Structures are given as C-alpha cells and as structure tokens.
Structure 1
C-alpha cells in the first residue's frame, strides 16, 4: 500500500479542486500515475488511511485503480486516465458521439457499480464529474467512498451548500437515509448526464427548488438522444420507494439488452 514519494516524478497538472490537486507523473521513471495531493485540513487523514486498506482490495477494470498512498507526510496514487473528467469529455461536441458510444459509457459505469455493490461498498458521490475517461475511451468510476473523510460540512450534510442535491433521492434529502438505493438514484442521474451531453441536472432550478420538485414527484425528463428504452432504464432509478429501485445487476442486464436491441 505504502509508496515512497521518492519513486515519483511529477510532470503536469491534471486538475485542482476543494480537497486537492492532481498531477500527472511517473512511478520509478517508467509507469504513468495520477498523484492526488490532499490539501492540508480538507480531510480526516488518519480515518482515510485505515480505509485505504479495504479500498486497496477494490479492483475492477471499470474502477479507477488505487496504487497506493504516501502517508509519512499526504498523497493518493491512482491510475492515470488520459481523457480526464467524464463531464468535460461529454461537453466536447467535437466527439460527435453515437448513441451506441453513450450506452457503452453507461455500461462501463454500471459494471463498476455492480462490483462495488457486490462488495457492499457505496460510492456516496456518483456523478459524471467523478468519472474519468482513458486513452481508449473507457469510462471508469473514481473518488468512490472518499466523501466520508471530507471535513467541510457544506459538502457532507444534506442541508450543506456544496452537497450533491441533484444526484440525491428524496429519502437522502429529507432523512439522510443513505443506502445501495441512493447510489442507484445517483446512477440514474449520471445516465441522464451522459445522454444530455453533460447538461446540469434540473438546469433551470436552484438546489432548493430541485429538492422541492423531487419531493412533489417531479423528475428529469427524457434527453433528446435517449431512446424510449434507455429512458425507461434511467427512470427506473428514480422510484419514490427505494425498495422499488433496481440493483446494479438488474441495471447491467437492462443496458446489455438495449445494446443488443440498439435503443
């Protein structure tokens, strides 16, 4: 798990956020890595460190690979994803995506989430902004579980000003009821983000208005590029009743069937 920071060569900035700075680098002169440099005071680092052991055993081809941690200082060393943030990827209209490509990004994500669900592991913050894209156009799930160590309460509480209201089911917004089925809800919103080419969910609403809308039964409506069958899959994620929402196993079966049918 422990990486010697001396084996790292820093090369380029990839991205900055509230919790850290990610740089493109090499490990022992040769191997491409992303180095996540945690900002001092953003993170419950000693809690994270014990968690990093269960995370070092999470391994799936659609899950951004954790390589290790540098904890004698603090850095997280992960798989480098050359096409970067999925949300930015979706907004680049130059890709001129076929709907078959969009459905494949949904499947990549669903495969990752099916694996996490198999391990009773919650993402807790599934959204396009937390997916990455590799050099072969493969989507992988990133930053799964890490919100649990974020010290800023504007990010972590449901009433917080940086909480992911637009990816949260009513039982989360009302009661803080987090479950496999809040990830299923989030996944539905993600499929919407993909098929909308990276529009903000509830584009015309505030987070306050989104929460009021969701509570009354308002839903995201069908993106132009989504077929009726694709829309049926994303909408199935948004049942008012958590126990009426599919598993990730059932969602992956649904996506595969539409891939075969071509909806």
Structure 2
C-alpha cells in the first residue's frame, strides 16, 4: 500500500558499506537477501519529478548487460535510486588496475558486453547520452554493464548540461558544434569507449584540453590506434567516428563486427 511498482520502501534496505562519493553510493541489502547499490541523490542536484516519471519507463528496460534498476525511493529527500550490486566497480578504474594483466580477448568481451547493451537500448529508441568507461560497471564475474543511461537529462548543475563538465571527449562534431544528439552520437561515444578499453583506461586525447579536443575533432582529426588493438579492432572503433553521422554504423552492425573479430582472434 502506498507504493507504485517502480517504488522501493526505504525501510526494506540494510546499509552495509559506503562505496563512493550526484552524491553517495552505498552497498547494502534489500529485504535481507538481495545485494544492492543505493545511489543517494544530493538535495538540489536533480529534476526529481521528471526523473521519477522516466524511472517508470526505465523499469521496463531489461537486458543482461544493462545494470538492472530495482526502483527508486521517492517519499523523502534525498531520493534513492536502487540497482543490482556491481562488485568490481567502475569500468574505468578496473581498466587502470595493471594487476589484471588483461588479454585482448578479455578487452574485446568488455566491448561486446557494452555493444549488446547498446543494441538493446537502440532497439528501444533510448539514448544513453553519456556513454563512457566511467559510467560502465563490472560485476563479480567480470561482466561489464551499461549504467546511468539517460541520467544526464535530469542533472540541474549547468556545467554538465551544455558544450565545462560536459563530455566533450566523447562527443561527435555535430554535438560540439550544433547540440545535435542522436543514435549516432551514442555510436561515436561507443567508439571512444572501445578506445578507453584498449588503452587500459587512458583519458581520450590525454594531452589536450577539452577546448583543443573540440578543435581537433572539428578539423577531422581522430584518436589513434591503441597498441593493444589489432588493425581490425581499430577499424571498428574508427568507423564510429565518421564525420558524417549517417555513415556511422548501428549497434547491430558493430555487434556483428565485434563477433567476427572475436572469432578470428579466438
């Protein structure tokens, strides 16, 4: 009583460990048994009513490679967003841990995991809008999942919203010049993410400012081949960066290309 299907009763949460500091993220349990992460939204950081309405839509998105939304806690402030627990944290930090000594087949599987999530979203006409390694999460089996999908829409802090904390390094020319978002801006960002994976978490355009990156990209220049990427892998990531948005592949085509490489570099 008093809760929609999208609504979690905060009294059903057991908090166990802070994971990091939108605000704080904690690890805990739901109804004693189910591991969860609980993102606590800072007062004033988000358009909450719009987010709540979107959450209803988001609860119906379901795919193995998309972090599963369990629901939202709306009746008090700060509001909470509750997901499955991803024990190995952010993809970006995971990549940067040199101890893993990743084989390129593992890096390719990470790309494939994300590509599968993104093909699903594309099939639902849902844009991510801020695809990057910092946003992807890794579970205890090393499976990568897409997280924070669409979330940028409800952030109120203007520095994130338009072209000084905007994702310049993951944005195609039409976004940086004209604010033209589309499926093909997610495709661009995916290619940059493949670059992040194959670079073991280097910052894209690591010696440039955002300002310089925007100018580089606008002039037609691109990220170059990470040393761990084969010529075929680099071909895939590069195809995501065509100057013409409609010459960029779809996520279905990218998935087929990644599967082909996996098979050939098996």
Normalised by the shorter chain, which TM-score bucket? over 0.9
1:140 aligns with 2:145: yes
- Partner deviation per Cα, 1:115-165 (whole Å, 9 max, x = no partner): 00000000000000000000000000000001000001110101xx10000
1:122 to 2:127 alignment: yes
Residue in 2 that maps onto 1:72: 75
- Render the CA deviation track for 1:154-202: whole Å, top value 9, x for unaligned: 10101xx100000000000000000000000000000000000000000
TM-score by length of 2: 0.97
Q: 1:14, CA displacement in angstroms?
A: 1.0
Residue 32 of structure 1: SS of its match in structure 2?
strand
In 2, Cα distance between equivalents of 1:15 and 1:244: 40
CA distance in 1, matches of 2:82, 2:16: 14
SS in 2 for 1:20: coil
Instruction: Give, in whole Å, the separation in 1 of the partners of 2:172 and 2:24.
Output: 30
Deviation at 1:15, TM superposition (A): 1.5
Question: How far 1:30 sits from its partner (Å)?
Answer: 1.3
Q: CA deviation at 1:243?
A: 0.2
Cα RMSD for the two superposed structures: 0.6
Q: Which whole-Å CA distance do the structure 2 matches of 1:176 and 1:63 have between them?
A: 26
1:45-83 deviation digits (Å, cap 9, x = unpaired): 000001001100011000000000100010000010000
User: Is 1:252 the equivalent of 2:255?
Assistant: yes
**Other structure's SS at 1:84 match:** coil
SS at structure 1 position matched to 2:228: coil
Consecutive unaligned residues in structure 2, runs of 5 or more: 1-5
SS at match of 2:127: coil
For structure 1, which runs of at least 5 residues remain unmatched after alignment?
A: none
Q: CA deviation at 1:20?
A: 1.6
Q: Distance in 2 between matches of 1:31 and 1:52?
A: 20
Structure 1 runs of 4+ with >6 Å offset: none
Q: Aligned residues, how many?
A: 259
Pairwise CA distance, 1:110:
0.1
Q: Structure 1 length as normaliser, TM-score?
A: 0.98
Cα deviation, 1:235-255, whole Å, max 9, x if unaligned, reads 000000000000000000000
Secondary structure, in 3 states, of the residue corresponding to 2:24?
strand
